[PDB]
Design a protein around this ligand. Structure first.
Ligand code: NA
Length: 119
């Protein structure tokens, strides 16, 4: 089982770019469909608590689920247990792609090349 877990979705242009880079680097990874098999709530909670990243960075703010639910108004009210439950309940709510190493979040989205992580 690969040290790297790559969460993606078919209709996701950034995911396709990121996966192409993983292939070019020949890094071992396990690709998981974030809608069919989202990360567990306990795992998401650990990221929310320990990554140092702000809560909103974990949400797919350009997606329908986020808009339809008005999370814009609600996010500042959520506890991290509440947010982890929410995210775990609908993979379409979660920012993608995600790159995870041995259970630890190492990159959300694809603003910078994975090679910079220097694994
Ligand atoms: Na990523």
């Amino acid at each position: 089982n690969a040290m790297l877990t790559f969460y993606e979705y078919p209709k996701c242009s950034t995911c396709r770019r990121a996966k192409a880079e993983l292939d070019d680097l020949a890094w071992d990874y396990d690709a998981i469909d974030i809608k069919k098999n989202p990360p567990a709530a306990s795992l998401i909670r650990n990221w929310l608590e320990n990554s140092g990243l702000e809560l909103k960075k974990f949400f797919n703010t350009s997606g329908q689920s986020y808009r339809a639910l008005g999370l814009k108004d609600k996010l500042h009210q959520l506890s991290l247990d509440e947010a982890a439950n929410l995210l775990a309940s609908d993979g379409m709510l979660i920012k993608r792609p995600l790159l995870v190493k041995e259970g630890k979040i190492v990159q959300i989205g694809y603003r910078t090349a994975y090679e910079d992580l220097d694994f």
